[PDB]
Amino acid sequence: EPNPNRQPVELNRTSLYLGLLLILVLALLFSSYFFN
Amino acid sequence: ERGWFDILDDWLKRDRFVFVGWSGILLFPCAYLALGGWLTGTTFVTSWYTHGLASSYLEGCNFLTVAVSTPANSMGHSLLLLWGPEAQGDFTRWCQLGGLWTFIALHGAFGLIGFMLRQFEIARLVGVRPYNAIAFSAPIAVFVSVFLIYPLGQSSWFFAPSFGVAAIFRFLLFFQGFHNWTLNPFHMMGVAGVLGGALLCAIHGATVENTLFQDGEGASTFRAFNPTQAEETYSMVTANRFWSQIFGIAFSNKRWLHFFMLFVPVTGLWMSAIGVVGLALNLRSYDFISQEIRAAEDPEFETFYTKNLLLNEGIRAWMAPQDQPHENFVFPEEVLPRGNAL
Amino acid sequence: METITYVFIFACIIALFFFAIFFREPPRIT
Amino acid sequence: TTGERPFSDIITSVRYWVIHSITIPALFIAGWLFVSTGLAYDVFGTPRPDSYYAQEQRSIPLVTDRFEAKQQVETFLEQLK
Amino acid sequence: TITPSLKGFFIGLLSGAVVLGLTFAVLIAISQIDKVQR
Amino acid sequence: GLPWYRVHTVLINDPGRLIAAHLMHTALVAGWAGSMALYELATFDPSDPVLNPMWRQGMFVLPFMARLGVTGSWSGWSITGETGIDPGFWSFEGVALAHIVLSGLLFLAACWHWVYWDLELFRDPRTGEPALDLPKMFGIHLFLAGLLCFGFGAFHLTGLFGPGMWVSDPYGLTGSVQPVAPEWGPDGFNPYNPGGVVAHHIAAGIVGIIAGLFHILVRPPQRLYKALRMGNIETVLSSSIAAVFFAAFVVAGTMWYGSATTPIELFGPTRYQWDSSYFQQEINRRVQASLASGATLEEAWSAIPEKLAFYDYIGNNPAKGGLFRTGPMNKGDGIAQAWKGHAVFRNKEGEELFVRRMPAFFESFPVILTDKNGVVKADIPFRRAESKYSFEQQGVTVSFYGGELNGQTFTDPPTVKSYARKAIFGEIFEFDTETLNSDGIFRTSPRGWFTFAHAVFALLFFFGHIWHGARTLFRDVFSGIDPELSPEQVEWGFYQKVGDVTTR
Amino acid sequence: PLGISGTFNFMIVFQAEHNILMHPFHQLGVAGVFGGALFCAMHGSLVTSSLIRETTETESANYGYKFGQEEETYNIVAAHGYFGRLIFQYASFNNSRSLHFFLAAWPVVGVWFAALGISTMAFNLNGFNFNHSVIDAKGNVINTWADIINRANLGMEVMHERNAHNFPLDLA
Amino acid sequence: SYPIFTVRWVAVHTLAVPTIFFLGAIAAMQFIQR
Amino acid sequence: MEVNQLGLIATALFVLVPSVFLIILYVQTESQQ
Amino acid sequence: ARRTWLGDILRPLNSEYGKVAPGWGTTPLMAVFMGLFLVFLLIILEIYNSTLILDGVNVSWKAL
Amino acid sequence: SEGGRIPLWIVATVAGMGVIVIVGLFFYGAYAGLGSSL
Amino acid sequence: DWRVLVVLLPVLLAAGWAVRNILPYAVKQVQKLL
């Protein structure tokens, strides 16, 4: 009984690089406040 | 059905020199009153009874020092309606008590709502996507968090920003001394968004202007463009190669590039607003506890963090008596923090 | 511990730069 | 175009300048007199140079009550002799 | 009891209705006079 | 494929899997409440409701159980200090357990609705397409909300069939769960009248019942249906988000200013009670009444309840914390042990002096002592070489009345200055700083954290309303504008009415 | 300094010693970067608003543009038609070349002024000084917001480099 | 050919009329002595 | 220095959980045809 | 689609997708309730704000 | 009457000189009377 | 208050002067839109 609404998901390589850069930079920014 | 509602709709949406629309019924009076209140107040109205300050051209202030100042701290968060229990319908007392400040801030708030409704309204008539309205949520988040939420968390409107050039400068310095606001990572993200937005603005403008196609014979290249032409006016391919070889990376998708230019400043302003929401409650990023523990015990430990707190301490002690006159601070000379000689 | 954490995060970013420049998706004209 | 008359048309028309060579100076002079007669001070409640303080006092007449603020200002204004 | 501020509240209510009423009165009027041609 | 920020749009046309996703969300939220309550119960110290109440201990959901009548543990204690009580099943533990069990049942329901997604109920009987009649759903759900609203006020809050709610005196000294009668007069709109809370729920519930019946029986006008896109489920999301951020701003405001539903014994004092010396005035009034009635200074102050003195202390002011100063207030100044007594300062002339209290704005504050008329009589100087007001020069001493130092007087400058530093914080307490390795830096209370999270979420949800509102009204151009847009529609003059092609 | 908190230290002492906030070149610099950020979001939102429909709703609109394609990807006439009505027709650009020149010029000129502010306050030509500029009929000082700024600046001045000055004037 | 009193006419004068009045008021202020 | 020791795991999960999310999505995009 | 006993019971409650009332319908009545609601919010706001002060309504903890 | 009579460049020049007169008056006021520090 | 009349008088005379110079066309504009 296959659901017709399924759709493939994509993340291209540039989006991976942009996303990893955002997370790493956010971590570099907030880490000092986490260690306090 | 062509009743009065539809006939009114016809008239509001006429293609005139100044489009009006339904949004205009809210936008135009509130914008006009907020602006006229600011001009009226900075020209004629004092801050003597609320702040102990002169603040109008009438009193001798100049464009940098005039303000419409906040009400006295004793008003709390009162709406300060002209017909309310404080002014009691007395226009002159209302002005002396700070009624123009809430007048400007409240009509300004509703004016901003009206402008954003105008962006939605015009976008729907012309047939474009409403991303300009969406981007305008950032100035609204800033205005609401700084001029409304922040004082609402504090003791009264008095601590909101006053509407003036030098008054806003005092607000910047108050935030350094009391809140250590430069240390706040939500402000840092805001700075990144504003400076990065200015960066993108300069670099995209310069890049377009320096990858133009020769589409005319004159040395002024502006003329060689036609609004209805189908071709790109500059070379995306040459621009892409330039930045890939100068910087390592470059844009290759022009739709992504312009979404990004929306994204960066809009997100930055939104982040700064969140931090100000924290400051409404004094929920500051004031200290690093680890630094304080070390510095308390080790009088040779010094960093730019400890140096900056000493500055904040100077700001608080030297500006508080004049800046908060209702508190009646009397700080004798001997208690004032001072370095050697100065 | 905190010094290791800061330097590690920094080092990952410099590695990310290398891949984003030299192992990017090539822009292809059409 | 939206149908209104071009601005460049209007402001180079003698009739515009016949009308506004009067209306503009008349408004300017009304503004001057609003100040020169001292009326602006009394409309907005702004101190004159000689009414910030009483002759020997150096305290600000600062408002300190919410609902008696009107009376507080009137009291401060009386004490100017 | 009608306190002074409750009186002031009613005055604010009447003032705003008056302002909104004249605004729409004038607007409806003008829209009826200057109709669009279809 | 779908970009990552759109994966959840696959539910827009699939009501059964929408219900499954909504069931999974409800299971997660119920499981969070159960597990948060269990965590709080494993760390809560019930042994001192006077100087170590829940709000000093970082408790967040415990006050919400107590507010509506859950006050006891199966292990025999209650939050008001009683021992040997039997709460029945509805203890803190029984409430947490009930939420955990509910979480698991909703999880099972979610799996059923995910697998059996193609139910005939979700199909339009005429077209066979998936379809939800949102106008009638609204009336059904509003009708259920009104009944529930009404029964909450009529039975739970009144005590008719239920426990009532937490109520206290104006100084937060004697709080407990009490049946509350509705207030039907204009004071029912006073935020501090618990009676208005009862009346609101009975009256708004009846209105919701009536409005629910209306919305079940009367279809939307064609003009509202078209204008608000009532066939598009995303219009409900847009207006629902707007109602939710409206609500979030209101609960942040009533938490910060105080109201009958945010009592100080559950969430801590407000900042404004320090701004106006609310507790200090009540303390002084009681001491005047004793002194006037013949008691000595030591009897007058010893009669002050420790709980009342503890409110008159800036360490319990929620405006003294910091964004990254984490944990309970006890982690800052320590676990309060005892009132030290009221410090009285005198100079060598025997005049009484009063320490200027710290305003909430200042991380630090100088030490300045005045007479009753506000004249500076002593201070702790920064530069010593031209000090005239030093404690040494002015012969400042401190005497304690009430509390553990009752009857003692100190005259050595260092000890007197020590207590003067503490006196800028209000009443002076003994703290255990060792048990938690407290660091001596103030933290905010649950009142502060609740307010901050809800103001931030409210503001962010404003962007959600704008975004989903825009998607509803501009669905047709979501992928771009018409490739055949005529320049004449967007150039000036061609149409008399903007965007209306019939007005060339 | 080459650090985050060191930058703030530099900024605060700068304000104490030059009143940079009251200097028109820093004010022009603020207009440059506030304006640059405004025009950035402006240009981004208008182009994004007028993208030509080339994709379905389940895909990123970014796939509607292809690197190197000859034809423009948005309708500048529709963008100008929206923004001209938002304000008035003659406050809107329809020449993409002069629009992009404006985006280049505004922040660059502003930051030039900011740079020249720091460079000329290097030689102690400082911000406007209105300390005690307003005087009443008797000669009492009437404070303005400028005098409140001065109070804050004094606190910064007397505390910075707290062990470094032996003589009463901080002349460099 | 053109009308005289339009919406644009009103918008122009609600701004321009007070501006001139204020400029005259501020010009007068330059001659006030303490 | 007396840092908060939860800072370590807080920073580590902050980097790891969202980074891993992105890697999963990327790799299953490449493996499609 | 799959039929169930409960689905058949609830069927009438999801059968009128798209059914509207002609024209403006009850909009003018809606507008009246919206206006009354606006005035209600203004009243409770201004009471909390101490801009509207009523006899025997003391906006303070001292009302217990 | 008919727009065109008075050339725009003379209008621009007269309006410009009026601006300079009024702004110069304001800078004069910074050194005299109120707000002059004297 | 006489200062009120001294101030409004230059404005009132300006209103009347512009009406003299515009009333022929004003009536003609109102007539056309009827």
Ligand code: CLA
């Ligand atoms: C058209 C847009 C608009 C909007 C949104 C506002 C909004 C505001 N004005 Mg502004 N104002 C406007 C135009 C507008 N104004 C205009 C054109 C003028 C020039 C006259 C002013 C002059 C002005 C002054 C002098 C003041 C304000 C103030 C305010 C604030 C309080 C208003 C209030 O409480 O009214 C409440 C009234 C309503 C909400 C009207 C609604 C009527 C309902 C819907 C109908 C039912 C009423 C019923 C028929 C009457 C029953 C009465 C009976 C029981 C006795 C609010 C921000 C006050 C302020 O800013 O405080 C600092 C203030 O003092 N305004």
Ligand code: CLA
């Ligand atoms: C409404 C939400 C809410 C509120 C108000 C509280 C309140 C409280 N919690 Mg609770 N808690 C919650 C939800 C909440 N909690 C949830 C969902 C969980 C499960 C994770 C918990 C689990 C929990 C534990 C285990 C503990 C608490 C504790 C506490 C107390 C101390 C809080 C503290 O120190 O925070 C500190 C808060 C911060 C440092 C704020 C973080 C700011 C974030 C990281 C910013 C992120 C920015 C982001 C990356 C930027 C994106 C940018 C991009 C979009 C461009 C306080 C009473 C403590 C306690 O005392 O118990 C007795 C405690 O031990 N809570």
Ligand code: CLA
């Ligand atoms: C009742 C609330 C609600 C519901 C049922 C929805 C539903 C939706 N949103 Mg909306 N939205 C909301 C509130 C809501 N939203 C709010 C408050 C905002 C402002 C922040 C938005 C801003 C927004 C934008 C900008 C967009 C959507 C989109 C969507 C659609 C796709 C979402 C998706 O696949 O994300 C996938 C998300 C992930 C895979 C990971 C997100 C991780 C987040 C950022 C951090 C983790 C949050 C944490 C786990 C939970 C915290 C809960 C919090 C409440 C405490 C979907 C219809 C998208 C759309 O319209 O598609 C056409 C879209 O572009 N929403």
Ligand SMILES: C=Cc1c(C)c2cc3nc(c4c5[nH]c(cc6nc(cc1[nH]2)C(C)=C6CC)c(C)c5C(=O)[C@@H]4C(=O)OC)[C@@H](CCC(=O)OC/C=C(\C)CCC[C@H](C)CCC[C@H](C)CCCC(C)C)[C@@H]3C
């Ligand atoms: C101080 C910085 C700053 C100013 C002065 C500013 C100004 C403006 N921004 C606008 C738009 C925008 N700004 C945008 C993004 C940004 N804007 C930014 C920052 C600013 N934006 C930043 C940093 C961003 C990046 C996110 C966008 C996307 C837009 C627009 O689409 C829109 C535009 O059309 O630009 C071309 C225009 C809105 C016109 C309007 O609302 O009329 C109505 C007037 C009203 C409602 C009166 C408001 C009254 C205010 C709120 C309070 C009173 C203020 C006093 C009158 C003056 C006080 C002055 C003292 C403080 C010195 C206006 C030119």
Ligand SMILES: CCCCCCCCCCCCCCCC(=O)OC[C@H](COP(=O)(O)OC[C@@H](O)CO)OC(=O)CCCCCCCCCCCCCCC
């Ligand atoms: C002429 C004086 C200019 C002085 C400042 C320089 C402004 C222009 C430089 C910005 C560089 C941006 C990046 C390059 C962007 C770029 O590549 O430019 C390209 C753009 C168009 O180039 P063209 O080749 O078409 O024309 C330039 C020459 O080739 C001659 O035709 O250049 C210009 O428009 C020059 C305009 C000169 C006239 C401008 C006068 C502006 C003065 C306005 C007053 C400002 C005072 C403010 C006080 C607060």
Ligand SMILES: CC1=C(/C=C/C(C)=C/C=C/C(C)=C/C=C/C=C(C)/C=C/C=C(C)/C=C/C2=C(C)CCCC2(C)C)C(C)(C)CCC1
């Ligand atoms: C408040 C109020 C109100 C209102 C009022 C109004 C509305 C007003 C308006 C007003 C106005 C509307 C005013 C205006 C003014 C203006 C001015 C004052 C201007 C000036 C200018 C100048 C000075 C310029 C300069 C310059 C520049 C800027 C740049 C370029 C060059 C030059 C140099 C030229 C009412 C009654 C309702 C009520 C009560 C309250």
Ligand SMILES: CC1=C(/C=C/C(C)=C/C=C/C(C)=C/C=C/C=C(C)/C=C/C=C(C)/C=C/C2=C(C)CCCC2(C)C)C(C)(C)CCC1
């Ligand atoms: C199956 C079953 C069962 C069981 C169940 C269970 C066991 C459950 C559990 C559940 C649970 C246990 C749940 C939980 C949940 C949780 C959650 C859901 C959380 C979340 C969180 C969050 C979301 C957070 C966030 C954040 C962070 C992290 C940081 C800060 C900021 C914020 C706040 C944002 C039973 C036997 C009954 C029976 C039937 C079957």
Ligand SMILES: CCCCCCCS[C@@H]1O[C@H](CO)[C@@H](O)[C@H](O)[C@H]1O
């Ligand atoms: C599914 C396992 C959960 C079992 C929980 C049974 C607790 S039941 C609970 O027990 C208490 C004993 O002190 C009594 O005070 C209370 O009356 C009773 O309801």
Ligand SMILES: CCCCCCCS[C@@H]1O[C@H](CO)[C@@H](O)[C@H](O)[C@H]1O
């Ligand atoms: C010189 C030290 C002894 C004099 C009394 C000091 C003020 S009192 C002292 O304050 C500490 C916080 O600083 C608390 O932890 C402690 O419980 C309390 O006794």
Ligand code: OEX
């Ligand atoms: O080095 Mn760095 O800071 Ca320029 O002032 Mn002098 O010196 Mn020091 O004092 Mn201030």
Ligand SMILES: [Ca+2]
């Ligand atoms: Ca004199």
Ligand SMILES: [Cl-]
């Ligand atoms: Cl320094």
Ligand SMILES: [Cl-]
């Ligand atoms: Cl020296």
Ligand SMILES: [Fe+2]
């Ligand atoms: Fe561009």
Ligand SMILES: [Mg+2]
């Ligand atoms: Mg002068």
